[PDB]
Design a protein around this ligand. Structure first.
Ligand SMILES: Nc1nc2c(ncn2[C@@H]2O[C@H](COP(=O)(O)OP(=O)(O)O)[C@@H](O)[C@H]2O)c(=O)[nH]1
Ligand SMILES: Nc1nc2c(ncn2[C@@H]2O[C@H](COP(=O)(O)OP(=O)(O)O)[C@@H](O)[C@H]2O)c(=O)[nH]1
Ligand SMILES: O=P(O)(O)OC[C@H]1O[C@@H](n2cnc3c(OP(=O)(O)O)ncnc32)[C@H](O)[C@@H]1O
Ligand SMILES: O=P(O)(O)OC[C@H]1O[C@@H](n2cnc3c(OP(=O)(O)O)ncnc32)[C@H](O)[C@@H]1O
Ligand SMILES: O=CN(O)CC(=O)O
Ligand SMILES: O=CN(O)CC(=O)O
Ligand SMILES: [Mg+2]
Ligand SMILES: [Mg+2]
Lengths: 410, 410
């Protein structure tokens, strides 16, 4: 199995890369996160913004799997399903995936008033909380009405003291029963034991592609806590809960932009808050695929990149959005941190007082839409060479526009 | 890096195996769980029951690491530290590990009144809940008094509505400040960036052994939910949050008993509730290393074992407690499940109505203390051969008593 992982703070271009390479796989698997994710595919002038639907959906011969460590908003997934034809037998949702309830999004919004993490307000964190509490509802529960009713009854009891605090509707209980009466029949045909499916697929030598969501620096354990998502986002997360094991991982494709973004609060050493950062936002159209929030923009940070590469075991890199830098006279790359007169070459566990140390590169003019290495300007290829040398991983895919085919393969 | 994982429901003999093989490693790493774990080492008539302390502690040249996905009761860890000499520079606790507060154990006990999971009542689940909420305190916070005070102040506000419900002391707030004034100075010298330590150790080719806690069937995602622990327990969990990556995993040693146990509630297809199960409990001294609860006992279940082997990628097996079966005339092994007239060869996602189908093996008389394959009775070796054939993984370690040296290496 191969894994596509974002090695920054999300939105690196994972949807584009997965869609570009998915034709050569039998399964494409979303393995963590929820509909906080937003993965944009563009082909022939048509854009799809996927949230939980895996990015193999444009190849009908692929089997798309939503695996057990995902958190599922059933209504939102059904709305994604309605955008494609004949998804029966090419989309499967794990019976072990946990279910996001409206309470979760209301609780997310409420706690955000005081925590100020900048979550997507989709209820992801609270759903993972109920999973750890072992009180959460799983997709398999939707297959039996009596089991679902017992679990919903426990949920109604458990949340009663928070009805006013969380601004829960006075018809919350009747509305939620009606929610499942509406959406359970639509989603139930897709619910399967996907763990067994992937155990068997691995044993049979089928080609499996695992699609990460978020990025390494948003990992609950190893990212910029508490400014992180509530799931593990590294490549090993793809073999924790899918039915695969670490020995099955072959290629690990780390996705990185030629600059940096994050959306929401938290440390960002190479952030550019000057009008150049605003230029990156405008030219790169850096607005959240899910929330439409303006992203924070900055320069590529190789200290953080080396850390993420180590945690993932990247065997190749995909370098994205080189075209956004067209016309910028000087490109900065953070190669180290200064901290109180100390030069840090290694990503620390606390980013307080870490100031970027920049190396500057000569810019280029017209990488947009280029499809051959021969046609890239010398200064682009010099930038690429530097990144490869510093990180120690070959850049094998280069993206020069949102379009699927505007990609160089090496 | 090599990984030792329990492939049943915990208590397979992981502490014994890790201690038996740890002399040949530079690092021994606990990577998940908390002091719910209880790992028993016996050597020369002296027993150590470890809970969070890694099982390389009896080899002073080893470096023992408590990694980031662990949950840490500081008082309990300090009490373990006091049992060994000169642990400075051979024990390191990740600055990213989360801290178990007394509130967590009180909340665990309270929710257990209605959930009846049968947790160890150590506060593990609630601590992982606060991690997903991104409100949890991490070990690195203990290194700065101002940061700890701000986080404790938020904790006091957050828990106030539960003071009566959870039977929190009226001096809870002053007691908890005093708790950290007592224990933070003792633990602070051990707190380090262990992620960077293991990134570097892996890059340098040092020998790393990862010690699992619990077992595969207790995995939060893929185990017998909700009768599971709140962490991931498979071998990939060892490369999610430690600083390693899946490509670094070499050997995966799956630890299994020659029969089965679980402690706490939940499905157990091969459970034996007759006096034979009571005999297994007495002869095997099957009482929880942590809680002293009597374990539920039963027969080896190869359907569940094949599932766990697939999730972990086991390259070798360690077969434990063969000596407990000495004198039993017929040994049963569950080779399949019957479910409503259907024969299941593959572990299903719901164990309801699954009845064990048994194959019977001729017993043996005196495997206890045997140290050479030549000295094992033919019927023992026939049993071993069958397990290896059915599971497809070679049994490389055979344990014939609690003692470190009562182990056969192949
Ligand atoms: N200009 C440009 N845009 C790109 C390129 N690759 C992807 N995109 C667009 O960049 C944005 C990436 O954000 P997003 O879809 O959230 O990334 P993901 O979450 O990693 O899939 C989307 O609008 C993509 O269509 C590229 O090479 N150049
Ligand atoms: N009789 C016998 N006891 C064993 C053997 N291996 C380990 N033990 C004991 O079996 C129990 C294993 O439970 P525990 O320590 O909780 O296992 P762990 O959690 O996997 O380390 C302990 O009392 C060990 O001392 C064996 O081969 N034979
Ligand atoms: O509890 P959450 O709702 O998950 O928010 C926690 C933090 O993580 C951010 N976040 C969550 N998903 C993100 C994403 O997804 P993709 O790369 O898959 O498209 N890309 C970028 N940022 C993302 C949020 O802004 C916030 O900072
Ligand atoms: O929330 P928790 O306190 O973790 O309880 C959840 C469930 O998991 C059991 N449990 C937890 N740790 C266990 C263990 O550890 P070692 O193998 O590492 O010694 N061995 C066996 N069972 C174990 C508990 O009995 C319960 O069923
Ligand atoms: O693509 C998804 N994001 O950028 C998260 C968001 O929209 O906030
Ligand atoms: O070794 C630890 N266990 O068996 C868990 C417990 O004691 O309950
Ligand atoms: Mg996105
Ligand atoms: Mg134990």
């Amino acid at each position: 199995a191969d894994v596509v992982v974002g090695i920054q703070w999300g939105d690196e271009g994972k949807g584009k890369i997965v869609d570009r390479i998915a034709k050569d796989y039998d399964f494409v698997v979303r393995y963590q996160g929820g509909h906080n994710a937003g993965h944009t595919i563009v082909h022939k002038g048509v854009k799809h913004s996927l949230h939980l639907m895996p990015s193999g959906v444009l190849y009908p011969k692929c089997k798309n799997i939503i695996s057990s460590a995902v958190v599922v908003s059933v209504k939102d997934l059904c709305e994604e399903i309605s955008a494609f034809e004949d998804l029966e037998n090419r989309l499967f949702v794990s019976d072990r995936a946990h279910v996001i309830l409206p309470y979760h999004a209301k609780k997310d919004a409420f706690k955000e008033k005081s925590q100020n993490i900048g979550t997507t307000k989709k209820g992801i964190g609270p759903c993972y909380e109920d999973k750890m509490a072992r009180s959460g509802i799983r997709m398999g529960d939707l297959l039996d009405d009596k089991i679902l009713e017992e679990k919903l009854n426990a949920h109604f009891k458990a949340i009663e003291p928070f009805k006013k605090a969380y601004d829960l509707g006075e018809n919350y209980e009747k509305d939620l029963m009606g929610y499942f009466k509406t959406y359970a029949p639509k989603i139930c045909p897709f619910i399967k034991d996907t763990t067994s499916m992937l155990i068997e697929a691995n044993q049979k030598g089928e080609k499996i592609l695992l699609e990460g969501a978020q990025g390494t620096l948003l990992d609950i354990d190893l990212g910029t806590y508490p400014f992180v998502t509530s799931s593990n986002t590294t490549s090993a997360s793809a073999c924790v809960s899918t039915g695969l094991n670490p020995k099955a991982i072959n290629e690990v494709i780390g996705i990185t932009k030629a600059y940096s973004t994050r959306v929401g609060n938290g440390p960002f050493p190479s952030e550019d808050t000057t009008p150049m950062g605003d230029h990156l936002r405008t030219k790169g159209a850096e607005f959240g695929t899910t929330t439409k929030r303006p992203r924070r923009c900055g320069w590529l940070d190789l200290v953080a990149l080396k850390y993420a590469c180590a945690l993932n075991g990247c065997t190749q890199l995909a370098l994205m959005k080189l075209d956004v830098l067209d016309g910028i006279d000087a490109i900065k790359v953070c190669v180290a941190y200064e901290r109180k007169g100390e030069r840090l070459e290694i990503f620390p566990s606390d980013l307080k007082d870490c100031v970027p140390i920049y190396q500057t590169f000569k810019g280029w003019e017209k990488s947009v839409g280029v499809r051959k290495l021969d046609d890239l300007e010398p200064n682009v290829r010099e930038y690429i060479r530097f990144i490869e040398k510093e990180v120690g991983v070959k850049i094998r895919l280069i993206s020069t526009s949102p379009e699927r085919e505007d990609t160089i393969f090496l």
